[PDB]
């Protein structure tokens, strides 16, 4: 689920793992580097690419006042799916 450097310490979702010439490896002695082991990139590549039969479609976020404000996105390119900046989940068109 997570990568780990050959120094033995876990990387994060941001690649900030320390080198061989630091002292923060010594500040982590005896106390665990509480890293979130749940990356945010790979939980979207597992999502189904939705296919909506219109041309320009809405995005709420699953609930009135529970979610991002409405974005209306366009689906006119043929090789690149439209992508909500808030959501991150894609759409396509069907005709």
Binding site for Zn ion (CB under 5 A): 59, 71, 84, 86-87
Burial 52-71 (b: 16+ CB within 10 A, else e): eeeeebebebeeeeeeeeee
Nearer to another protein, 18 or 60 (CB): 18
Q: Does 25 bind another protein (CB under 8 A)?
A: yes
Q: Does 27 bind another protein (CB under 8 A)?
A: yes
DSSP 74: E
Closest separation in Å from C-beta 16 to another protein? 10
Lateral strand order in the sheet of 50-52: 50-52, 90-93, 82-83
Residues near another protein (CB under 8 A) are: 19, 21-23, 25-27, 29-30
């Amino acid at each position: 689920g997570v990568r780990t450097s050959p120094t033995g310490e876990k990387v994060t979702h941001t690649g900030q793992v320390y080198d061989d010439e630091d002292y923060r490896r010594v500040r982590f002695v005896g106390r665990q580097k509480e890293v979130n082991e749940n990356f945010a990139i790979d939980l979207i590549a597992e999502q189904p690419v939705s296919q909506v039969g219109s041309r320009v479609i809405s995005c709420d976020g699953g609930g009135g006042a529970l979610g991002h404000p409405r974005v209306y996105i366009n689906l006119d390119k043929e090789t690149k799916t439209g992508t909500c900046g808030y959501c991150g989940l894609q759409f396509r068109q069907q005709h």
